[PDB]
Design a protein around this ligand. Structure first.
Ligand SMILES: Nc1ncnc2c1ncn2[C@@H]1O[C@H](C[C@@H](N)CC[C@H](N)C(=O)O)[C@@H](O)[C@H]1O
Length: 277
C-alpha cells in the first residue's frame, strides 16, 4: 500500500548482482580500509572509529541536525562508534553507552580516541527494560532489519516507545533510529512525538539503499509524511536507474587522548574500566 512497502517487496526480488549495484547507488560511503586494518591488528594507539556508524552521527552533527552536549546517553551502543564520536566533542562532559553484547550482538571495543576517559560502557544491558537516567543528549541507533515488514514495524515502534520512556525534561537533544518509517503506525507515532517534543525526521546519505532507515532528530522541524514519502520516492527512483557508484568520503578519524572537560584524571579507575572492557 505505501511506497515504502513497494520498495521493500522490490528490494527482495533483486538478483545478487542487481542488489549489490543498487545498495550503493548514489549513496555516500566512508573508506573503512585503514580502520579495519588497525582493528584486526588490535592497535589502540590510532584514532580510528570502531564502526562505520560513526559516519552517520558525524553527518547529523556537522549538518546541524543534532547538538551533542553535556551528559550523553547512547542506547544500543554496540562497539561504541557513536559513543566515541560524542566523547570527542567539545561541549560533551560525559558519555554512557548501554548495549546487549550477548550472543550475536556486538560488545563495546576499547579505544583511546579523544575523551575515552569520559566514556563508560555497560554491556548485558537491555535498554527497553533497564532503569532510565537523565541525559542532555539522548542517542539510540537501535533497529534490526527483517524480511518481515511487520516485524520491522513492531521493532521501530518499540524503539520510539522506549525513547519516550528515557527522555527527561532536560533531554533537549536527541537522535533516534527509525528503522521502517513508512508504516502508518510509525508515521502516527512520530507525528504524536513531534507534537510534544518538536524535531523532525531525516535520511542520512550514508545509509545504504537496502534500508529505509531514517533518524528522528531534535535540530530541525519538518513534515514527517513529506520527508518519508520523499525518501521512498528517492529509493524507488534509484532502483529504476541504479548508478552502482557511491560517493567516497574520508573516514571518521579522531585525535587521541584524555579530556579534562571537575576531578583530575583518575588513571587507577581508568585502568580497571579498560581492564573490564
Ligand atoms: N534492547 C536493547 N538493549 C541494548 N542494546 C540493544 C538492544 N537492542 C539492540 N541493541 C544493540 O543495539 C545496537 C545497534 C547498532 N546499530 C549500534 C551501532 C553503533 N551506533 C555504532 O556506531 O557502532 C546493536 O549492537 C544491538 O546489539
Amino acid at each position: 500500500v505505501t511506497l515504502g512497502e513497494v520498495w521493500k517487496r522490490q528490494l527482495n526480488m533483486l538478483g545478487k548482482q542487481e542488489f549489490e549495484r543498487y545498495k550503493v547507488s548514489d549513496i555516500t560511503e566512508v573508506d573503512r580500509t585503514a580502520a579495519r586494518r588497525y582493528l584486526k591488528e588490535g592497535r589502540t594507539d590510532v584514532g580510528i572509529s570502531v564502526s562505520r556508524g560513526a559516519a552517520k552521527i558525524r553527518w547529523l552533527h556537522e549538518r546541524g541536525y543534532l547538538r551533542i552536549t553535556g551528559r550523553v546517553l547512547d542506547l544500543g551502543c554496540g562497539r561504541g562508534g557513536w559513543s566515541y564520536y560524542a566523547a570527542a566533542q567539545k561541549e560533551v562532559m560525559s558519555v554512557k553507552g548501554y548495549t546487549l553484547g550477548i550472543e550475536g550482538h556486538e560488545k563495546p571495543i576499547h579505544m583511546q580516541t579523544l575523551g575515552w576517559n569520559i566514556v563508560k560502557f555497560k554491556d548485558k544491558s537491555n535498554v527497553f527494560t533497564m532503569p532510565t537516567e537523565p541525559s542532555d543528549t539522548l542517542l539510540c541507533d537501535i533497529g534490526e532489519s527483517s524480511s518481515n515488514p511487520l516485524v520491522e514495524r513492531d521493532r521501530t515502534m518499540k524503539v520510539l516507545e522506549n525513547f519516550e520512556r528515557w527522555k527527561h525534561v532536560n533531554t533537549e537533544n536527541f537522535c533516534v533510529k527509525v528503522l521502517a518509517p513508512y508504516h502508518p503506525d510509525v508515521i502516527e507515532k512520530l507525528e504524536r512525538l513531534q507534537l510534544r517534543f518538536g524535531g523532525g525526521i531525516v535520511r542520512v546519505p550514508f545509509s545504504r539503499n537496502s534500508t529505509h532507515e531514517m533518524y528522528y532528530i531534535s535540530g530541525a522541524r519538518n513534515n514527517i509524511t513529506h520527508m518519508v514519502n520523499t525518501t521512498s520516492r528517492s529509493l524507488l527512483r534509484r532502483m529504476t536507474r541504479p548508478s552502482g557508484k557511491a560517493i567516497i568520503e574520508g573516514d571518521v578519524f579522531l585525535p587521541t587522548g584524555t579530556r579534562s572537560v571537575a576531578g583530575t584524571i583518575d588513571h587507577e579507575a581508568l585502568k580497571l574500566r579498560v581492564d573490564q572492557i
